[PDB]
Amino acid sequence: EAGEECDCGSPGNPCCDAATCKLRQGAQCAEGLCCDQCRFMKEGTICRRARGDDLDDYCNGISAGCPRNPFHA
């Protein structure tokens, strides 16, 4: 758990995939950025670049990517 509810929320692990960005759900900016068709908000949602001990961000123009504005402090 980083920002939002979702264990599979990882930048590249579209809030679940257990194989490859292709979750029948739709990790569109879940606990962590998504990479599957899932889709993405566009407004400061959750670009969470990482978790571990830190690393985060908000969703903007995040078609499975991440904006260029400062979010994680």
Side-chain angles (χ1 to χ4, degrees):
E1 229 168 355
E4 280 216 61
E5 320 194 65
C6 161
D7 320 84
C8 318
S10 280
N13 320 7
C15 193
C16 295
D17 40 285
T20 15
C21 303
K22 78 128 138 115
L23 71 196
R24 298 230 50 77
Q25 264 265 240
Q28 330 94 349
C29 282
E31 170 239 8
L33 225 280
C34 140
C35 130
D36 184 38
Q37 317 312 52
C38 89
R39 204 134 168 289
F40 311 85
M41 258 82 182
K42 274 296 175 79
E43 160 188 23
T45 320
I46 254 101
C47 141
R48 309 247 130 204
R49 326 226 312 274
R51 249 245 40 78
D53 274 60
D54 320 279
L55 308 327
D56 319 282
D57 263 301
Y58 279 57
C59 276
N60 281 250
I62 37 38
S63 56
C66 279
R68 280 215 302 153
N69 320 119
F71 294 112
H72 161 77

